[PDB]
Amino acid sequence: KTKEHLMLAALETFYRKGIARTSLNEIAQAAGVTRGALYWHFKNKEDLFDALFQRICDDIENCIAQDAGGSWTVFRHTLLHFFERLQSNDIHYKFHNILFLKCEHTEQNAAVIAIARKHQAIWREKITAVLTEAVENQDLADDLDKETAVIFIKSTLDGLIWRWFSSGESFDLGKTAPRIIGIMMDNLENHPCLRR
Amino acid sequence: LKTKEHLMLAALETFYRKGIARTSLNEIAQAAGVTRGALYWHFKNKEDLFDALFQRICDDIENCIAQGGSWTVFRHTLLHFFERLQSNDIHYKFHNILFLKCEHTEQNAAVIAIARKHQAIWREKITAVLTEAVENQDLADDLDKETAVIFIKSTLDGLIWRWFSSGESFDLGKTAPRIIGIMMDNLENHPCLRR
Ligand SMILES: C[C@]12CC[C@@H]3c4ccc(O)cc4CC[C@H]3[C@@H]1CC[C@@H]2O
Ligand SMILES: C[C@]12CC[C@@H]3c4ccc(O)cc4CC[C@H]3[C@@H]1CC[C@@H]2O
């Protein structure tokens, strides 16, 4: 509860001031913990961020058993569960808020950004594996262009998150995300321009 | 009106290298090789430079429309917008700043409000293209236009965001037309965008 208390203080501070303008010492103030104890648990600020990203991912994967007839069906559930969690889980809300809006791509953030890309590369391969299992079960056609489909998926879903935050949550994500996900899946299943 | 454009581009250039939050007027005026006062005459603050930059992006897009049916004109304008992102350094840098170097902190609050104003304008313009397209029967009378405009913007936002934040990992020239085609098809045919 010491290591956790520090990450939530990192998250709360990142959300307030942004990643670049946040210091390993002002995180200590929020957590109310000596810097040597902080250094005990994490080397530097990228570490706090890497742990926040890992917690987000753990939460998604831990629920996948509870989301799970067939794996392409599980994907649908996991996508829908993701967007509900954005609304109702304050940790996932703030973290994605930070990732899309509070993490500017300047040299000051270079190390944090490389951490983001490590986790996104893991997610990119998660998608490929799901597409691959789905072709094998014949939920997707055998000539599905998997490299293109992966860009299409990340593009479609990133766009909805970006739009939602940028608008200031000015539309109902609970009604809109299922429409968007519905259209996307239909396109992966049926549209010719995602075939090789 | 040519002094204004030189001050504007020094800001765009400085915003691109440092981001908006860390740029100061001093550095802009320096980059432009003019005094603080002379900059101040044309532009009071960074908000006003960013606003003018955003205004010039929109002017470029609108001027090229002026040179089929409007629903066909829309498709062409989406396609050319993404070509322009590759081949036009000002549209590249600007959208790079808007999506990657425009943090949503309190110091940037005024710039963000600027950005929302222009995004609102574009939303109204998209809403009109959909309204005209319906009456010309390029889209169905039953088209859910409120959802459709969210759908169009997040489709395009997603491409731009994904291309910039991945370090331009894929070829926008092959990807953008394929995304825009699929979008166009869904607007015309997908039943999720109706009723
Ligand atoms: C699509 C995203 C990457 C891939 C993620 C994934 C990847 C595999 C999987 O089985 C489920 C999910 C759900 C959340 C998805 C993410 C939501 C937004 C992000 O871009
Ligand atoms: C979707 C955007 C706003 C609406 C823009 C528009 C709005 C109306 C129109 O007739 C054409 C275009 C092309 C470019 C579009 C933009 C590309 C990026 C921007 O977010």
Residue numbers in the entry:
A (entry chain B): 10 to 77, 82 to 209
B (entry chain A): 9 to 75, 82 to 209
The authors write:
The structure of MtrR bound to EST was determined at a resolution of 2.37 Å using de novo phasing by single wavelength anomalous dispersion after selenomethionine substitution of the protein. The stoichiometry of MtrR bound to EST, TES and NDR is 1 ligand:1 protomer. Furthermore, β-estradiol and testosterone are positioned with the five-membered ring pointing towards the dimerization surface whilst progesterone is positioned with the five-membered ring positioned towards the lateral side of the protein. One negatively charged amino acid residue, D171 on helix α8 near the dimerization surface is positioned ~3.4 Å from the hydroxyl group on the five-membered ring of testosterone and estradiol and ~3.8 Å away from the carbonyl on C3 of progesterone. The alignment of MtrR-EST and MtrR-DNA structures reveals three major movements that result in the induction of the protein. The first movement is a 20.8° rotation of the DNA binding domain (α1 through α3), which shifts up and away from the DNA major groove in all MtrR-steroid structures. The second significant movement is a 10° rotation and 4.5 Å shift upward of helix α4. This translation of helix α4 coincides with the upward movement of the HTH domain, away from the DNA, as well as a widening of the ligand binding pocket in the induced form. Last, the flexibility in the loop formed by residues 114–122, between helices α6 and α7, allows a 17.2° outward rotation in helix α7. This movement also aids in the enlargement of the ligand binding pocket as well as a movement of residue W136, which is positioned to obstruct the entrance to the ligand binding pocket in the DNA bound form.
Transcriptional regulator MtrR inhibits the expression of the multidrug efflux pump operon mtrCDE in the pathogenic bacterium Neisseria gonorrhoeae. A member of the ubiquitous TetR family, MtrR is entirely alpha helical and comprises a helix-turn-helix (HTH) DNA binding motif and a C-terminal ligand binding/dimerization domain. Here, we show that MtrR binds the hormonal steroids progesterone, β-estradiol, and testosterone, which are present at urogenital infection sites, as well as ethinyl estrogen, a component of some hormonal contraceptives. Here, we show that binding of human steroidal hormones results in a comformational change in the MtrR structure rendering it incompatible with DNA binding, thus revealing the structural mechanism of MtrR induction.
